């Protein structure tokens, strides 16, 4: 039994959210730094598998357990609308719409959760799809990030979407090299965030 990329299933939800938590702090574990790290998958993983599970893929460890993922959306403007209309009501009880400016790191992420319009960056308009990709530390440096990425790009291209972007923390230079090796170019660095993109054709 060997590790392999496969489509996400609903029984991968727990593992996907945990991978997200464990990589959300500029690639590193968010648990030491946040009171409720569940806000991360609530903003950056769960809505994708809720709304567009057909674009979610996992790295299976060979024993059935997801140990990495790639997920995303075919169309960012539609995703933002759907996120507000369909997703936010499902999490607003647990994470209420903010009434005052963020006081804590936790409240900063809740602010992002409640502003999916953050995704409407003018410079990425020509790259309609976007993604998040993460692997648990023990699974990095094994070629599996590439396997995930190529699977996701093929899925987008098959759906007729020609271009994709992503965001990354600018200071995270190892991530920058990872994306560079996967054929991404710099779109813009507006903020601690860099946007990268490429065409989805192989
Ligand atoms: Cl990052």
Residue numbers in the entry: 56 to 245, 248 to 259
The authors write:
The mammalian O-GlcNAc hydrolysing enzyme O-GlcNAcase (OGA) is a multi-domain protein with glycoside hydrolase activity in the N-terminus and with a C-terminal domain that has low sequence similarity to known acetyltransferases, prompting speculation, albeit controversial, that the C-terminal domain may function as a histone acetyltransferase (HAT).
The SsAT protein crystallized in space group P3221, with unit-cell parameters a = b = 75.9, c = 76.5 Å, α = β = 90, γ = 120°, and diffracted to 1.5 Å resolution. Electron density was observed for most of the residues, with the exception of the N-­terminal His tag and the first 30 amino acids in the sequence of SsAT, reflecting degradation of SsAT over the course of storage and subsequent crystallization. The observed maximum opening between the strands is approximately 14 Å, with an opening angle of roughly 27°. In contrast to the classical histone acetyltransferases, such as RimI and tGCN5, with a largely solvent-exposed complementary surface groove, SsAT has a more occluded tunnel-like structure restricted mainly by the 55-residue insertion. Interestingly, in the SsAT structure a piece of continuous density was present in this pocket which seems to extend further into the binding groove of SsAT. In the context of the comparison of SsAT with hOGA that inspired this work, the divergence away from the classical CoA-binding P-loop and the absence of a putative base, together with the potentially less exposed core structure owing to the 55-­amino-acid insertion, support the observations that the hOGA C-terminal domain is not, by itself, an acetyl-CoA-dependent histone acetyltransferase.
